[PDB]
Design a protein around this nucleic acid. Sequence first.
RNA 1: AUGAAAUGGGAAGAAAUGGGCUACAUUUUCUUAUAAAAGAACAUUACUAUACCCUUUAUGAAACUAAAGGACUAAGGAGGAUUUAGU
Lengths: 132, 52, 205, 80, 357, 49, 101
Amino acid sequence: KNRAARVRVAKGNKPVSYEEAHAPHYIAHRKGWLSLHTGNLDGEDHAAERTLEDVFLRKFMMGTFPGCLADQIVLKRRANQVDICALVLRQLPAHKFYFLVGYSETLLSHFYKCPVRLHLQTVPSKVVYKYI
Amino acid sequence: SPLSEYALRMSRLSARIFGEVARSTDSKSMKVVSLFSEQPLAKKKETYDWYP
Amino acid sequence: SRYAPEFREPLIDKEYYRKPVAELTEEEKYDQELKKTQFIKAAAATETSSVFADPVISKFTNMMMKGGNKVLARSLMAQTLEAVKRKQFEKYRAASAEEQATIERNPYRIFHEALKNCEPVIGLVPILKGGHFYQVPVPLADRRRRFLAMKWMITECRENKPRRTLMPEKLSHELLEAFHNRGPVIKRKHNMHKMAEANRALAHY
Amino acid sequence: TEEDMDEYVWAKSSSENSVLQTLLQMRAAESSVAPSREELLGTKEVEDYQKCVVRLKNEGENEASLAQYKESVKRLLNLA
Amino acid sequence: AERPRTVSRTSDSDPAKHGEQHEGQHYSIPLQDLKTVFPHGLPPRYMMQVKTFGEACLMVRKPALELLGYLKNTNFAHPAVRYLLYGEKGTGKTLSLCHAVHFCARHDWLILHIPDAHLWVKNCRELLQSTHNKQRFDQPLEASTWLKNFKTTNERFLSQIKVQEKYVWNKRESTEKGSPLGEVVEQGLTRVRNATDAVGVVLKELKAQSALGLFHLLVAVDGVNALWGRTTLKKEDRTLIAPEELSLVHNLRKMVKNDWHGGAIVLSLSQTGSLFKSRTAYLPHELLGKEGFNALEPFLPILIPNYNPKEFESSFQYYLENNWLQHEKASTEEGRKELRFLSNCNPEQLERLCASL
Amino acid sequence: YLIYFPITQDREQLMFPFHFLDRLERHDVTCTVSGGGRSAQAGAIRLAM
Amino acid sequence: YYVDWRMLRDLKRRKMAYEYADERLRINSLRKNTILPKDLQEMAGDEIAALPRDSCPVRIRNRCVMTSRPRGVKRRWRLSRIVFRHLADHGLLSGVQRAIW
RNA sequence: AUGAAAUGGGAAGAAAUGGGCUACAUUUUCUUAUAAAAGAACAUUACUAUACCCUUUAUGAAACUAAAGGACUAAGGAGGAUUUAGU
Ligand SMILES: Nc1ncnc2c1ncn2[C@@H]1O[C@H](COP(=O)(O)OP(=O)(O)OP(=O)(O)O)[C@@H](O)[C@H]1O
Ligand SMILES: [Mg+2]
Ligand SMILES: [Mg+2]
Ligand SMILES: [Mg+2]
Ligand SMILES: [Mg+2]
Ligand SMILES: [Mg+2]
């Protein structure tokens, strides 16, 4: 049996999101890609470096917004610009989010030497695709 | 076929223009041109910056 | 298979399509109208309306082919037919008028009558009962009876020939020697039938 | 040398020598006094043969171009 | 019908009688002329047809009629004319050249017929060196076989012609001036070491003596493209040899030159058996090359095409007249139309297709 | 087609369309086959014809 | 901290080969030819040998940047088959999908 | 010190067994073309060594590795029961 990225069946009481519900073979069929860069296109270089930056950027955002992320972040690179699109729960006060955006943007712009912007869409609670 | 004088002297005239090796060089001695025309493996950014 | 089960085997008979409508039996007439609403398989690469195409010989060519080398197998069969025609022409010219009548110079007719002479009516299927090997008389279908004749010929020539002889020269010498009911392949057929007689009692098992 | 040249030049070639030698043997058999080189290679017969060989060498060789060459040889060699 | 069967044979056994009226008609070559004029040079598959049918019959065709016309009007005083038969595979070049060899043979010409010239540039199992010139090599077996056939064809003229010089074969053996040319041939066969040298003497003698008006000389070389090409023979150093270095190829290159008179040179091109040439090469420059073309010019190219409608029907009826086409459907109009498509009127392909049928 | 297709089975495959409709020697065909081997190219031409 | 001590040794091998690249290029050129006296070539063969062993560029091994796995690595991403499969199977690699055909 | 680092080594088999490779040839071997056709070879080394041995080239700092020639050539003559894959 295949155990990869499959949120296994419980007893109908586990709330899975749309992204979690779909197994790897549904990538490019029902669900898209969380990161979009040009480094895996044919005849393009720097796939290794773009992928390493993504791994870090996901661990950074989880720790910087602990318990406030409703779903996985979406990374969008255009030219040298990096854009982080995160669904965040409305737990923290509004002014605290302005602090973490100013901090996380400046810190990651001086670390990777690119303009980095953070885009946050606030949800009242995690969105449940189905109960499995 | 063999290369007559006209053919050989034209080939040297071409090499002189295109900055190619002009003399008769053995295959062994052509590696010197390769070594100094190509970035060494240890100087390529993939090797020395392999790791984060 | 890449053909859905609804596909129909193609019919490559030139005369059949051009026959007058009244000459066709109503059963055949029905199939033509039905096939108009069916899917037809594409014809094979070796399926043509040629008047020189013989299915029996075409099958014999495929049973000699090795590793998909059809050009070589067809060449060997073509050389065989020629080697049989040239062997009968020599005999015909070097024979009296009375003898000349009997001599057959058609290689296609010597090939068909040779194979038929090597086809065994009954067979033997080896069985194991009680820790021994009891082979028992069996009856063979029209497909199994024809396959055995062709297989026995292609195996006598492949193996029991001198090292420097070639297949067009051993096969030609066997089609003609079988065509007269005296070859070793005919003996293989005779041995099959004689064993079946011996095992008449063991047919029950 | 001739091999180096990319476009055939009938003048001062193996063809011109072979043609001139044949025409010299032809006039000698006729019992005529030995003729000049320019005389033999100025005739119209030799003019046409030059054009046909050049076409074969440069324009390209084909059954059509070889047929034209066949006629020039017949005129040059006085063949029926 | 059998209307072309009447056109499938001609009663004019003698090649001189043939004319345009005889086109597409098969003339039987006399049995004695096969064992004398043609001990070699007939294609291998054609020889199989002669054994099975029991008779050799050569279709009269327009290409071979044009050649016979030039040979009749030959101006012996003028230098020899090189006739080059060029055509695609199986078109009949070899048998068109053999038709000329029959015409000259019957008029009492001296036949110098090289059956295949590719055999001298490949698959040699004994390659010695030449005493005459140490740079050259000698092919004893290749020369020995040719001499035996040259002797058979020209046996009559081997006593009349006589050597004009002295040839020292060995310290103990030499040929006195004046002795018959047959002696040179006899020594070559007797002592295989000198075989490659007897051939050179024969070619040299005939070329010089022909101009004296004693006899006419037909230099018939089939496969002439081999002489000025490449070889697949290697020296003791395992280095490939060149055509000129071989003694047989060197001598022959002189005979195909137009520097003599008293005869005619008939050449043929064959990509079959050729070394380092493509399968679809038939044109003169493609096969001869730049070296071969310059050597032979001015030459008269004679295209040998595929069977025309009249010739194809005559060939079809000739096979039917011998009972060769034993298949029941071969005689029918649908069979004939099929064989015309598969063969495409190519003489060789039609012979191969009918062989199996 | 005799030069391009030296194998008989390839030529027979080109004969099948015309021979079937008894139209041999009545049409002039110009083909352009790219890709595949000898047998695959004859089969592709047969359908195109 | 690097993943393990094996990745640390390799990192040092990669930084010492970069330092001695020009030197090992200039010296090794004197040996890869037939134009210079064999006495000089035999001596240049010893100058190259005397350089530190970690300068030699054939002692570099490509290891997964995240797990330091010596074998199974894909050179375009510098990740092992196991690590690459985890990022790919979750939609985290841009354009990488499963191959169905 | 069961931690770290450097240098040098990590050997072989009258052995059994699994899988693969090549061969045992004539539907074959060599050569040119190309799988068309042609000319040769064809049983003692003819077929036939991707071993050993000997040279040369490639990568390397290091040949102990790989490739290409060279000779040397042994065994192998289609394989007992039994067993594998393929619609
Ligand atoms: N004049 C002819 N009379 C009879 N048969 C002929 C004639 N011309 C051609 N053929 C047939 O064609 C076959 C080939 O002829 P031939 O050998 O002369 O051709 P080719 O063009 O010289 O061939 P290649 O290019 O292979 O040397 C013959 O064996 C014969 O079956
Ligand atoms: Mg020929
Ligand atoms: Mg390594
Ligand atoms: Mg320790
Ligand atoms: Mg072949
Ligand atoms: Mg070295």
